[PDB]
RNA sequence: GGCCUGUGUGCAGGUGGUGCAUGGCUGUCGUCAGCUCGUGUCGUGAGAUGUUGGGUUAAGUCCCGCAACGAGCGCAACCCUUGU
């Protein structure tokens, strides 16, 4: 089950990767070509792990589960804080504090002083 | 009862000793700006981060990214005088 379709994928262009020099070897099985010195990722692998992770959440979701979105790139803040806010959903897109989940006593006080 | 003359009883009485046992008070480093704690994280362990780098100020006074998030004694203010 999927919304979002292949050719379209293709027209969006997320099947880039990087350059020869950052390519990680345990991704080797998801690689599936390089040309030009830029790699190809698995689209069959990534609408079957997209659907694995759509069942995902929706049982998440379902059972009342939490889900915080973590984004620092500067091409994505703004489409991630637009999506966050419209959906209604905690969110972080600027910057991440050190040992944010780990305390969250401490910025419990923050919070209230807030 | 008060007070004390003669016997003592305990005991008063000592600027006699011990600031290498002390209380309190005081001088210098220096009116220098440095010195700490809660949680977390890392390493095994003595430990490290926070307190690193750039800019700025008389000052750990402040801004920027950074496993750090906060707080404390200090710094300035609140007190006196002098200038209208
Ligand atoms: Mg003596
Ligand atoms: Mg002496
Ligand atoms: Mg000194
Ligand atoms: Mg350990
Ligand atoms: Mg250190
Ligand atoms: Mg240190
Ligand atoms: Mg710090
Ligand atoms: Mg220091
Ligand atoms: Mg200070």
Same mark, same amino acid.
């Given at each position: 089950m999927? !919304? !979002?379709?292949?050719?379209? #994928? *293709?027209?969006?262009?997320?099947? +880039?990767?990087?350059?020869?020099?950052?390519? $990680?070897?345990?991704?080797?099985? +998801? @690689? +599936?070509? =390089?040309? $030009?010195? @830029?790699?190809? @990722? =698995? #689209?069959?692998?990534? #609408?079957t792990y997209i659907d694995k992770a759509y069942e995902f959440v929706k049982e998440t979701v379902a059972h009342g589960g939490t889900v915080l979105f973590v984004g620092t790139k500067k091409q994505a803040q703004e489409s991630i804080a637009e999506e966050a806010t419209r959906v209604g959903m905690p969110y !972080? $897109?600027? &910057?991440? #504090?050190?040992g944010m989940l780990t305390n969250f006593?401490? !910025?419990?006080? &923050? *919070?209230?002083?807030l």
């Open positions: 999927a !919304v !979002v379709t292949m050719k379209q #994928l *293709l027209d969006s262009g997320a099947h +880039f990767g990087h350059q020869t020099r950052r390519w $990680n070897p345990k991704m080797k099985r +998801f @690689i +599936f070509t =390089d040309r $030009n010195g @830029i790699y190809i @990722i =698995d #689209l069959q692998q990534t #609408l !972080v $897109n600027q &910057r991440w #504090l050190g006593s401490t !910025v419990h006080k &923050r *919070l209230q002083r």
